[PDB]
A paper describes a structure:
During the process of helical reconstruction, as the resolution was increased, an additional separate density became clearly visible and readily interpretable as a phospholipid. For the F pilus, it became apparent during the process of helical reconstruction that two populations of filaments were present, differing slightly in the rise between subunits (see below). Instead, two 5.0 Å resolution electron density maps were generated for the two F pilus populations. Superposition of the structures of pED208 and F TraA reveals very similar overall structures (root-mean-squared deviation in Cα positions between pED208 and F [13.2 Å rise] of 1.4 Å and between pED208 and F [12.5 Å rise] of 1.5 Å) with slightly different boundaries for secondary structures. The amino acid sequences of both the orthologous pED208 and F pilus TraA [name] are similar, except for the F [name] N terminus, which is 4 amino acids (aa) longer. This longer N terminus could not be traced in the F pilus density maps and thus must be disordered.
The structures of the pED208 and F pilus are very similar, with overall dimensions of 87 Å in diameter and an internal lumen of 28 Å in diameter.
Author numbering:
A (entry chain 2E), B (entry chain 2F), C (entry chain 2D), D (entry chain 2C), E (entry chain 3F), F (entry chain 3E), ...: 6 to 70
The structure:
Amino acid sequence: QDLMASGNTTVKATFGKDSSVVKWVVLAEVLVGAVMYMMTKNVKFLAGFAIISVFIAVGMAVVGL
Amino acid sequence: QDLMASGNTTVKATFGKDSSVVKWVVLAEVLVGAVMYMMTKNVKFLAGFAIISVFIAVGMAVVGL
Amino acid sequence: QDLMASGNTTVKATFGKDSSVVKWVVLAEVLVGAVMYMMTKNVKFLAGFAIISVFIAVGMAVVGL
Amino acid sequence: QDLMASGNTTVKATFGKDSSVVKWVVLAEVLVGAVMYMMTKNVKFLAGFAIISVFIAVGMAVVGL
Amino acid sequence: QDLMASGNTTVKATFGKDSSVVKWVVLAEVLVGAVMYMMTKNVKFLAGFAIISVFIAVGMAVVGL
Amino acid sequence: QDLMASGNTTVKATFGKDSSVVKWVVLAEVLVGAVMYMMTKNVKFLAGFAIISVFIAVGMAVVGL
Amino acid sequence: QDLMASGNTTVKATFGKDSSVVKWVVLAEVLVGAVMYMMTKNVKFLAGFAIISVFIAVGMAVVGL
Amino acid sequence: QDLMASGNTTVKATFGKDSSVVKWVVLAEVLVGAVMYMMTKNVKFLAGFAIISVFIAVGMAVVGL
Amino acid sequence: QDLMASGNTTVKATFGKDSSVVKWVVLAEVLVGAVMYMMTKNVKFLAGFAIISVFIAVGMAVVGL
Amino acid sequence: QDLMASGNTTVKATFGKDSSVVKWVVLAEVLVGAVMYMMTKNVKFLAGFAIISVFIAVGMAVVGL
Amino acid sequence: QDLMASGNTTVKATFGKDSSVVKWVVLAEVLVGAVMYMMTKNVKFLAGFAIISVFIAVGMAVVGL
Amino acid sequence: QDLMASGNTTVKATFGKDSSVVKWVVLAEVLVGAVMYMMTKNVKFLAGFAIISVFIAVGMAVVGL
Amino acid sequence: QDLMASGNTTVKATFGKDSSVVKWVVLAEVLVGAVMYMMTKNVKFLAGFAIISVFIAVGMAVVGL
Amino acid sequence: QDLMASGNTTVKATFGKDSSVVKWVVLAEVLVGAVMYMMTKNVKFLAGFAIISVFIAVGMAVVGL
Amino acid sequence: QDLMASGNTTVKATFGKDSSVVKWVVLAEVLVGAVMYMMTKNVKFLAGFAIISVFIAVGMAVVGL
Amino acid sequence: QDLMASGNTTVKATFGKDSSVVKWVVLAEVLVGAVMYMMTKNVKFLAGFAIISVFIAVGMAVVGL
Amino acid sequence: QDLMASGNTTVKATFGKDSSVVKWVVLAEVLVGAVMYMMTKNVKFLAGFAIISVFIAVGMAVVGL
Amino acid sequence: QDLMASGNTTVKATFGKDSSVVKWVVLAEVLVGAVMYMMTKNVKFLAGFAIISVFIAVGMAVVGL
Amino acid sequence: QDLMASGNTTVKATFGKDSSVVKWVVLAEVLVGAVMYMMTKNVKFLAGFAIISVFIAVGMAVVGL
């Protein structure tokens, strides 16, 4: 029949590829990496900056409801 | 005779390989891992991202009602 | 529907390309590098000085809500 | 809205192009270089003496709140 | 009809975006983070300082009675 | 109506920008950093010395009851 | 009203610009630096010797209850 | 009131300008330098021999309880 | 009228600023810290040594019956 | 009246400036430091050797029943 | 009265200036230093060889029960 | 009484001036120095060859149980 | 009988010699090595570039489901 | 008689030398090592790659039901 | 089946032979080498300038998704 | 799709054939060479003076975004 | 009378200076040290190899029922 | 009586001077040293190659059940 | 009895005097040395080229299972 947890899925809107929360993540990510680099002065922290984004993309693309 | 817990199995629809709940899981999984990585900056948390999915797949394939 | 974490986004104002915090970062960055150079006397630490800025720019441009 | 870290920015006064701290830096810089030269007797250490200053200037000019 | 728990909602006044309690929270938050940093000397604890505030804001904005 | 946790706010006097406790913090902060430097002999620990102060200032300015 | 942590401030006497503890610090500082130099034979460790003192002075002057 | 770490200051006697420990330092200092010179045959190591002494003197004179 | 738990307050004598128990506390405190330092060899445990004392003082001064 | 935990204070005799236990502490302290130095070959561990002693002294002098 | 940890002090015999354990220490100390020198070929490790001994002596002389 | 670590001292036999281990040391010492000289062709490595031996001798003579 | 984890093995497709993930690896590998070389200017980092590939190949060939 | 846990031993099929799961292991093993090497650039992680395999082999050969 | 990390591969666009990032690399490479040469005045640093490019080319050609 | 690091490329403006930084380089290059020649009085240091320029040119021409 | 835990003391036979278990210990000890050295290539792990043995000996000699 | 851990001692066969495991050790030892030398090009790693063997021998000879 | 790690020893085949891996080693060894010589132009790196081989031989001959 109907799976009862169905419907809704503003969950998607909530978490969607376009969503506040998503944008939140990389934001602080951008920060801390930039932060960390001051401390470290190593080239490390600029990756998931891009990577998590596409990482986000793929899993979002993977699941995407 | 008839096992009385039988019938129904919208349970399947509820939990099925295609189900809200399933999609829910990996979603937050994608999140927390991405979250964790900001904190950790270790390559760890991108696995069950894929793995749990196929892990889901196999057990779902294992049982599948 | 409406993703509930939406609205607000003074978060943007908070973290925006024009924001206090952003300006904070490079500031101390300028410092420590200048600091470090006294110790090191190597040409190293003048990069993210510029780079993080454009690094900031791109990610800000990448996400930008 | 209002980014909450805003206001204040005696931070600027604290770190500004005219600030104690800034003047502190080059001071010791002048020292150690002069110090180092006694040891080294190489022409090295008189640079950021001027350079960091303009380096300070540019980043200060770069960010400048 | 009338939901009996209704009325009142000095609860709001009690817990509102403007309320003592709210202000209480971030206060001690400011403290402990500043406290922690002495111990840790890591850049960690200055976040919910801002973040919880907007976190407060959003949930307050989310529910807001 | 009246939020019951209201009134009082000697809490402010207790924790205010001018308060014992506040002054307590930076004090020990000054100490441990000076302490740490003996051990480390790195330029690290003189920051929140100033920074926490303005950090205190801003959050105090942020909330300030 | 009265902030309860107030009064006392033999804390000041305890930690004051004139205090045992303060004098303790630079003392061992003088030692270890002199110690270190034997090992290192680098001109490094004679700084906070003076610097921490004025560093002490400023923060003491900064807070000073 | 009375700073509790006060009194005592056999600490002074312990570490004083006249103290065993002080005399200990320069002693081994004299040694290692003389030692080092055998290896190095450079004129380096005869400095803090005198210098640390006056260095000791000044900091001792600086703090001197 | 008369609060029945009143009178007595040898409780004070029992717990007073001058009391056995009070003196007991810091004693073992002195011990364990000294103990701990052997294990740790970190400068940590000498604080409440002084601090708890004044901490004791203030709360004692705070309440003091 | 009489604070009941009073009397006794063989506790003092037990823990006193002259006591077995006290002497016990520095003993093992002397050991482990000497031990550690074999491993480390750093000049670190000879401090509380003297310091804890006077540290003991002061707190003992601080409290001293 | 009598401090209960008193008596015994075969502890002394155990750890005394003449004791097995004491002799144990310098022994391995002699070894590792001699060991280390093979690796290092630096004049470092022959010190506490003598020094710890007198270091032992003094602390033993310091405490000596 | 009796220090419990006493007795035994086949430890001596184990490590004694006449012991396998002792002889082991200088052996490899002889080797590596001879080895090193091939590489270096400097007169360096023939010292503790003799020196460690007498170094061994003295410390052995120093402690010698 | 049938091993239940069997079937599936899109795992292979997932991780196969031809797979996204595989290609991902060497990619970043190419990067970081090229990155590192800028810093190091040593010939080091161009190996697993080729090597991991054949390393991948062999293990893939080793297991290959 | 018959040990009741007997029979079955599709467990073997499940875990056998030829089994999905087994192949799973080394797979990710191949990955992480290759992964790690990018980070480390040390020759470490290519061992159990082969070794665990034969390690698997032996224990499998050891037990093998 | 379908390897879930598949699709996407704007990763390619991201990192492709034609990509911003790629161009970024050699750029700074050109810089630092030119920089280094001022310091060194050795012919060293003009290699990966060309070499990394073809190095990039080959690995890109090697993997190229 | 769109490579996310794209756009921006004021990076070019930043580092372009016409850019401050570029002009900076050769400047100091001109200096140090002229400097060096005083010391050396060898004809060496006038090369990258021209050469780096065309070296700059070619790599700039090579990459040029 | 008779202490009831008495008798038995095959415990001795179990744990005695000659016992399986004892021999077990040093065995694995020999292993891991030899193991560790491969990893470390430091001279560390060959000690309790001998030492624990005599350590065993002494405690065994100490207690020995 | 009989120490219960007795008997067995295929443990010996397991770990004996002639045992697989033993031979395993030196094997990888031979490898890594040879490996290391490529990296280091120092004469270091050929020792326990022989030494551990006799080290094995002696401890094996020491315990040998 | 039977040492359980026994049997197998395709380990030998794996690592044997004739084995892939062995041949792998010297190969890259040949490379890097030839590589290094370009950089160094010293006669150094052609040794273990031959030496490791016989070094391999001896240890292989030493252990050889």
